[PDB]
Design a protein around this ligand. Structure first.
Ligand code: 235
Ligand code: ZN
Length: 304
């Protein structure tokens, strides 16, 4: 069965998306936005109090298969939203005024592979012509300085950028959805681990975003709020200098679409456990991360 303080396999997460929706139809609707290479359904949960128009914030988890705390956070976020609506002032206004588009797992095929074969798998599980090597790095597969830096053109490498921008069914599905709903999406948030960072554009170039000062002030405030809960220290800044240059990322691509608030989160930890974060830290990690997400949400709403 499903637990919010354990890592859940896809079969369980899938059944969870159905159950949590069935149990909260006045706050959640579920749609599929596409299929993965291996035929799994890419679910999207629209969280919020239904109403005409409504702006939105898009958040995805599970870009990279082995980053299990990411998948855990999207689920945690959804429960928080539904349980506290009507009782906590901020979440109530949030869900009244806007929708969160939550995509609990993008790279489902890879996630399954980490459960069944190799816990440290990263990429998708699509085949590549002319080689036995499997998979593309989804966060090198977007049309943002595609494959110009921090990427590989070799299918056998962990940062393979693919045959072309959006060559992967999953990345195409996400890009198609965001393009189809551009007018309403005001912020883009993508969840990864590990390193304890909040990153903003650009990662494919050392150039700074037009609203760099605002984004830095936002990231700084968000990390301060996150630390209030358990003292967890994050760093923040543009992708290229805060971690390293990496072209083709979803956050850079979302920003260049005109989504002015675009962030990558790198959750716990700093490398003691790395990708293999113990389930005993799921609760604390998700709790402090909620604070930063809600802070960003509060800000974005005030600057519509
Ligand atoms: C521990 C994390 C820092 C992950 N890095 S990693 O798995 O150790 C790694 C190791 C070797 C090559 C590429 C990535 P990540 O979440 O996978 C970092 C991510 C990416 O590589 O896609 C990243 C890096 C630079 C900029 C961004 C923002 N678009 C995002
Ligand atoms: Zn990642």
């Amino acid at each position: 069965g499903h637990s919010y303080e354990k890592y859940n396999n896809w079969e369980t997460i899938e059944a969870w998306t159905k159950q949590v929706t069935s149990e909260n139809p006045d706050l959640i609707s579920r749609t599929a936005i596409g299929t993965t290479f291996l035929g799994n359904n890419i679910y999207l949960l629209k969280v919020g109090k239904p109403g005409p128009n409504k702006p939105a914030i898009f958040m995805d988890c599970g870009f990279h298969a082995r980053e299990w705390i990411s998948h855990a956070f999207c689920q945690w976020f959804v429960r928080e939203a539904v349980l506290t609506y009507g009782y906590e002032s901020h979440m109530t206004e949030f869900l009244n005024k806007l929708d969160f588009y939550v995509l609990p797992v993008l790279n489902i095929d890879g996630y399954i592979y980490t459960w069944t074969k190799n816990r440290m798998w990263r990429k998708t599980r699509s085949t590549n012509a002319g080689t036995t090597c499997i998979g593309t790095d989804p966060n090198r597969n977007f049309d943002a300085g595609w494959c110009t830096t921090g990427a590989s053109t070799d299918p056998c490498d962990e940062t393979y950028c693919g045959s072309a921008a959006e060559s992967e069914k999953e990345t195409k599905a996400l890009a198609d959805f965001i393009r189809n709903n551009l007018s309403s999406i005001k912020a883009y948030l993508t969840i990864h681990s590990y390193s304890q960072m909040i990153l903003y554009p650009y990662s494919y170039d050392y150039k700074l975003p037009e609203n760099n000062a605002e984004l830095n002030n936002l990231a700084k405030a968000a990390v301060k709020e996150l630390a209030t809960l358990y003292g967890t220290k994050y760093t923040y800044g543009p992708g290229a200098t805060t971690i390293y240059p990496a072209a083709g990322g979803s956050d850079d691509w979302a920003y260049d679409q005109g989504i002015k608030y675009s962030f990558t989160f790198e959750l716990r930890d700093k490398g003691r456990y790395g990708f293999i974060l113990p389930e005993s830290q799921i609760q604390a990690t998700c709790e402090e991360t909620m604070l930063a997400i809600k802070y960003v949400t509060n800000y974005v709403l005030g600057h519509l």
